[PDB]
Ligand binder design. Sequence first.
Ligand SMILES: Nc1ncnc2c1ncn2[C@@H]1O[C@H](COP(=O)(O)OP(=O)(O)OP(=O)(O)O)[C@@H](O)[C@H]1O
Ligand SMILES: Nc1ncnc2c1ncn2[C@@H]1O[C@H](COP(=O)(O)OP(=O)(O)OP(=O)(O)O)[C@@H](O)[C@H]1O
Ligand SMILES: [Mg+2]
Ligand SMILES: [Mg+2]
Length: 1154
Amino acid sequence: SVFSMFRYSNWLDKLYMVVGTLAAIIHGAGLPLMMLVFGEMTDIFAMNLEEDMTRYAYYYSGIGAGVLVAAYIQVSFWCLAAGRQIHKIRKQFFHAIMRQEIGWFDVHDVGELNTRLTDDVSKINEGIGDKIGMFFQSMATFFTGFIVGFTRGWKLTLVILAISPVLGLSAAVWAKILSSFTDKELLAYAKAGAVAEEVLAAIRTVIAFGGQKKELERYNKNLEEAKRIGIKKAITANISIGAAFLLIYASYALAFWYGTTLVLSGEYSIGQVLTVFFSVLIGAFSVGQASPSIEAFANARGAAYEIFKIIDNKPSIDSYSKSGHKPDNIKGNLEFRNVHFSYPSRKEVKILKGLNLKVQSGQTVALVGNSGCGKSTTVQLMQRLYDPTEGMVSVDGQDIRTINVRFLREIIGVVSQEPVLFATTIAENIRYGRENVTMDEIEKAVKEANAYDFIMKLPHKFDTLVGERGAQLSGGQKQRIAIARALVRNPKILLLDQATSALDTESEAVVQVALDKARKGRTTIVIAHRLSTVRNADVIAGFDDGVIVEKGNHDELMKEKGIYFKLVTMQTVSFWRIMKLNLTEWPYFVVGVFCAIINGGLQPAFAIIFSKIIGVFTRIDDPETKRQNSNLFSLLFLALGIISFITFFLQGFTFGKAGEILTKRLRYMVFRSMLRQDVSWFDDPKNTTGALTTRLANDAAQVKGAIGSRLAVITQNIANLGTGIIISFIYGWQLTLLLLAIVPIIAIAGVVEMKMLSGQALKDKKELEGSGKIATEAIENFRTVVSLTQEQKFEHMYAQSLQVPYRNSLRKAHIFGITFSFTQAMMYFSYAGCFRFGAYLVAHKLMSFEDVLLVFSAVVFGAMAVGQVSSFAPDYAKAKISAAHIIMIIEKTPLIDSYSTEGLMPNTLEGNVTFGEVVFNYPTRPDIPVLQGLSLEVKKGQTLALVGSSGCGKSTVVQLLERFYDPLAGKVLLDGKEIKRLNVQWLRAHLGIVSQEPILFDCSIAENIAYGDNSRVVSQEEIVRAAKEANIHAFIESLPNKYSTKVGDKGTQLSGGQKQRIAIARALVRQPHILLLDQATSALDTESEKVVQEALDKAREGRTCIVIAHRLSTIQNADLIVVFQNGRVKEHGTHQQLLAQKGIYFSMVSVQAG
Ligand SMILES: Nc1ncnc2c1ncn2[C@@H]1O[C@H](COP(=O)(O)OP(=O)(O)OP(=O)(O)O)[C@@H](O)[C@H]1O
Ligand SMILES: Nc1ncnc2c1ncn2[C@@H]1O[C@H](COP(=O)(O)OP(=O)(O)OP(=O)(O)O)[C@@H](O)[C@H]1O
Ligand SMILES: [Mg+2]
Ligand SMILES: [Mg+2]
């Protein structure tokens, strides 16, 4: 556990840290070393000045040169050691996640990882960089003060030193606590990031059903628990400083008393105590500078727990292992024998209860059965995503468990049940099948898949960017690309899973010929619910209760009159705006700023205290009195001590609490603003689920660190150094002019520092969203990328996007290092200058050296406080850009608004939809005319069927009615009223849709069905009443935990039919006036298809419907049918009228002639 964050440090990284620490000790001694020349001048106080002062000044000019080197070496080296290690952490951690199996993805929540990559790693960067360097600068200063003490003092040093262990232990006690709190706070943010990743993926269903309020308030809760842990961390860290500062001034008071005995004993002089106090007191302020460094390291330690926990884990069925067995001449042989298997998520249920099969080379197997018998499990087992409990899957004699994984997976082509594509060009989607592929092969492969014509018709033919998960293309076209992708591979075993579900009759027909032409050499297994495709296969198989019962040729199974016979028979500007948002918390700043000046301004004042204390010690010549008045001063240190406890704690608590209220305020509004946006906004190439969720975590975290507790210290350092120059202006004279004249040189260096950094961060921020895009793309589609065997390519792609920040991180160190060293060094020369200037003025008798020595002593305490403000600049530069983007997104307003109350909400509705002369284009592709002036009539109590070939604008009508996009020209009238003129939500409350490819949320089944109806308490009796009509009651009832079983991410646990049937239920909870079915019975059984139709037909009257489907048996029943053609509605009417006038409809139905 201990020091497990520095695992990937090279010999050159080691060299940086060792050389940095040695320089850090040398740099820290210089401020303690300045007091040595003062002590000898006090000894002289019991001709001189011009010879003595120049010697002491001459030393300061040399020190400044030593600081300019050491400071650069100190700061620069750690920053390099951080940047290189962080680069290796991100690359290793991502590689570790891809090494996992599917069962691990099934159990744990994958949505948490995306925020663990960007935010949680960035916390470590702050911990193990410059703060480690400064920590040693502080610690050298602390000890080097005592090193003078041992020479100058025998007991006085020991008396102060002996109360170091409390400071030493206290730091360990508070750190170990707040280190534990960090793990729990980060876990709260991870739970929030999962909600954002889920919602932004399925935004269309969220907009459709209109559940923005519920998802917003749920997202809010996770932030509430994060705030409560945050405020606890603030209280703890600020108390750590108060007690430490209290104990030092308390111990200083104890040290004074024994100092009073010098007159009685005669052990040492008053010249000694001034040396001892001036030596030892400097280190007191160094502790306050060290308090942030320990707090950073403790949080950075707390950040590491969960990252290395994933890296330390080892897989079961490893893909990266090269110790497997790989044969040469793989003849086609597949054997199942007595195979039992159950998933990890529900171990109680038994799906496969002993089956067996033999498939020789040159055989196309058909698997038939009802939804739930486990056809997809068999296909998913072949790839070896899960292993069997008993039974052996042997290939060509040898068992799968003995042979190699990667070698096995690169000879199996798989078209999954519901395909998914990656957001790139069409060429790259085809290229994921195999690396070294030529254009000629792709040309041939597409033409076999029958997806050539539409690719030729689109501009940028092979360079058209498909959306996230292939959303921009149609349902049919998307499926063909998956078919091509398998055929480019050219494997031995081909595995089709309902490959011709969304495709029409003509596309199925020609694709069948291409597959059947080049079948002889291959081995094939085909899943299908159409039976015409099943007719010409070699062997058919029937599942039943886990076991495969029936087998054989078409003739035999017909004569045997089993399940197959029944199936065949049945078919027949930053501070001004950002500060203003937190107008409420005004009394926190008033107390915080007031307290910072009082506790900050005490440190330069010591010289005034020490001068008066020294003066009162030698005021009156009489000795007995000195005993009494000296005792009171010791009480004064305790009094300041007890107040110091009150000031520092309150200062830190007031500022610390203020930030945590704002942090949550920033997040809540941005997520609320993003959820208002139009669909057109989500279709932009720049906007993506991964790109957005990264934008949430990064922007808030950048703002939080700059203006939180860290703001407070700067206020203390400004007041300190202000008080320093004020008392220099008051008591001193002709010094401020020489001191202040060097300040513009720091100012010129400061402006060029921020200008170089602030310009750099904008280019860095833009790239990191590009980095985030790939992770969310790879993680969400894990089954695709595992099946395709493309684990390296994504790591290589991920390595590119990280390379541009990596350069900036290295460059940043040198810019930051040069400014620090210069800003630090220019002060020392000023401390040389003032003494040398004092050498001239004292001689001529215009300035009093006794008073000059005090201002010299007073000004030099700020030297460290000057160094604190120098380290602030980068944080301000990153916040400036981060803030601008937040105000940009919040202030933006959409075209069609969901939160606007205005519109017309008519008390009743007749339910008559009309379309007339409608032209429309999508925003992403402006030139292509999808609809070219169509018209359509829909009245109450009627079902209108829409038909045509794949990609003739059927699903566009559904989307146009739901107000995702508005028409360019034309008109839509609801009951003789413009849909633009109506209220937005009001419309979406009445009508309800069933999408082409359903999506579900990570929740219980009851809540997914209850999600359909919002703004009302859904009764359970109605849920079961609906789910009885939907026809999934017996399935849910047989399952353990009833409705409380948690469905997976995007409906991954349940089978297609099971979720698709839920989607049907979710629609029927509302009892809508207008209804829209877009291939609602795509993948369902013949037994189900009737029972689903019965409920619709029995309760058809009253409401209105528009059906889209390829099954002519459904369209047979409908009132009037409509046929599309290149945008124009060519054919329309009733079944007898359309069949009489023998056009395309006759050609469409006659293709099924006997
Ligand atoms: N990853 C999984 N985790 C848990 N249970 C699963 C998983 N995949 C499938 N199941 C369950 O196993 C059973 C069989 O599912 P499977 O999809 O293999 O059957 P199917 O006949 O192919 O379904 P369909 O006909 O709808 O395509 C179902 O009851 C389903 O809920
Ligand atoms: N958001 C979008 N951006 C760009 N083009 C789109 C978008 N949505 C649809 N299209 C294009 O419009 C054409 C037809 O659209 P649509 O998918 O509605 O037809 P469809 O009848 O639903 O097709 P299918 O029957 O194959 O599902 C397709 O070629 C598709 O690429
Ligand atoms: Mg299936
Ligand atoms: Mg469609």
